[PDB]
Structures are given as C-alpha cells and as structure tokens.
Amino acid sequence: DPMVSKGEELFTGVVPILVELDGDVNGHKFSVSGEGEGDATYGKLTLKFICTTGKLPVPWPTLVTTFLMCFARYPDHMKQHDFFKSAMPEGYVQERTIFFKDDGNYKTRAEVKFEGDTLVNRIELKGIDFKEDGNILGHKLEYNYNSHNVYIMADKQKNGIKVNFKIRHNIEDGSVQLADHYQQNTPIGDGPVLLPDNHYLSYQSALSKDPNEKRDHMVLLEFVTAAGIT
C-alpha cells in the first residue's frame, strides 16, 4: 500500500526527536526542552527533558502525556489504522484539555512534524484554576507513572481523530490524582490521511533521573503498542 510505505520509509530505524514546551500555569511561567530518539518498529521512545527556566512549578509526571503517538508500534494487521504516521512529514496538530479532578486544568496545543530528519513536537501549555497548595502546585505527586490505554476514534467531520482517557497519578499519601484527558488531532497538510477504526494504544512509561544532571529534569522511557483490532 504506497500510503503505508511512505510512513514506513519515514519511521524505519531510529529517528532523532526534539521537544519544546512553553508553559504558564496560574502565571508560573516555564520552558522545557527535550531531546532523544524514537524507534517506531519497537514502539520505543527515550527522551530527557530539562526545565531551562529553573524550577519546574508543576510535577514532572503531570507533563508526561503532553511531552509522540507517531512512534507507536502498529501491528502489521493494523497498519491501515495508523493516522499519526499517515499525516507525516507535514505533520499533525494535537490539542488537549486535561482536567485534574478537584483542581485546575491544562489546555495544550502541539504541532508534531519533521524538520529535516528530526521529528519535532512544539507545545504551548496554559494551566488555569489551580490550587496553590493542591497536588500539582503543592508538588504532592510521586515521581512514577502507571500503565494506561488510550482509546482512539475517527473524528470524520474534521479529517482527524478524537482520543479520550484517564491518567491516575499516585499522590505521596497513597491516594490518586485523576487527570481526565480530552484530545483532538488533525493533519497540518492538505494531503490525505488514514482514518482509523476504534482501537487503542497501550502505554508503559518509566521515569528516572540523570545522576550527572544538576538542573531540574526528567528522563522518560515509553513503550507504545496499538491493539484492540483482531
């Protein structure tokens, strides 16, 4: 299928990644840069993020979903359903509202696209209505991350997809902070894309620290596989 081929040739081996985030949460401004690489054959991403502005005013875990679905591994039988690679190289927009239960919300806009050989994710994040001593501004979330599925449906009126899911962030007392994610993606180009049957992406994420890094940062290892079509 030459449409499938185009995504294949773009993603074949290891692809370098650059992420840039400008953020404002309740007027706490911050920027983050990330670098690493992805190998969509294995659904594997390795990234390190750095707050270039000093202290990150929110927990690193609350930014993981914001900081590359084009690196998911689609099983061979599901390649007709891979919207994300289909939109490349021109790319797609990914927009979210993320509602932290009993606290504020993030609103994000990203563009994901190639800049030469490099796969880039440029993000603007605005958070509003946060509690200054709540879980997020009060830094009460554990530095870890649970596995979740992400359910994808076509958004056919918009030549795009719609994605809905819940993340449960562990809080230091043992409870959980729900982050309800609403998401929409649309192609940046005027070219055609693959519109998928309902399916999901299974995410595993592992957070660590670079023992030689003094700045405020996060090392993220993520495995992403599509499923849910036999």
Curated annotation (Swiss-Prot):
Changing residue 147 to P: Increases fluorescence at warmer temperatures such as 37 degrees Celsius. InterPro entries: GFP, GFP-related, Green_fluorescent_prot. Pfam families: GFP (PF01353). Belongs to the GFP family. This is Green fluorescent protein. Keywords: Chromophore, Luminescence, Photoprotein. Changing residue 42 to N: In EBFP1.2; shifts the excitation and emission spectra to shorter wavelengths and increases quantum yields compared to BFP. Changing residue 206 to K: Abolishes the tendency to dimerize and leads to monomeric fluorescent proteins. Photocytes. Changing residue 162 to Q: In R10-3; matures to the red-emitting state with excitation and emission maxima at 555 and 585 nm, respectively. Changing residue 67 to L: In EGFP; increases fluorescence at warmer temperatures such as 37 degrees Celsius. In EBFP; gives rise to variants with blue fluorescence. Changing residue 99 to S: In alphaGFP/cycle 3 GFP; improves folding at 37 degrees Celsius, reduces aggregation at high concentrations, and increases the diffusibility of the protein inside cells. Changing residue 103 to E: In mut1.27; shifts fluorescence lifetime from 3.03 to 2.85 ns. Green fluorescent protein has been engineered to produce a vast number of variously colored mutants, fusion proteins, and biosensors. Further generation of mutants led to more stable proteins (at 37 degrees Celsius for example) with brighter fluorescence and longer fluorescence lifetimes. The gene is GFP. The keyword Phosphoprotein does not apply. Changing residue 198 to I: In mut2.1; shifts fluorescence lifetime from 3.03 to 2.50 ns. Energy-transfer acceptor. Its role is to transduce the blue chemiluminescence of the protein aequorin into green fluorescent light by energy transfer. Fluoresces in vivo upon receiving energy from the Ca(2+)-activated photoprotein aequorin. GO terms for biological process: bioluminescence; generation of precursor metabolites and energy. It comes from the Eukaryota. Contains a chromophore consisting of modified amino acid residues. Maturation of the chromophore requires nothing other than molecular oxygen. The keyword Membrane does not apply. Changing residue 222 to G: Suppresses the 399 nm excitation peak, leaving only the longer wavelength peak at 475 nm. Monomer. Changing residue 193 to A: In mut1.5; shifts fluorescence lifetime from 3.03 to 2.72 ns.
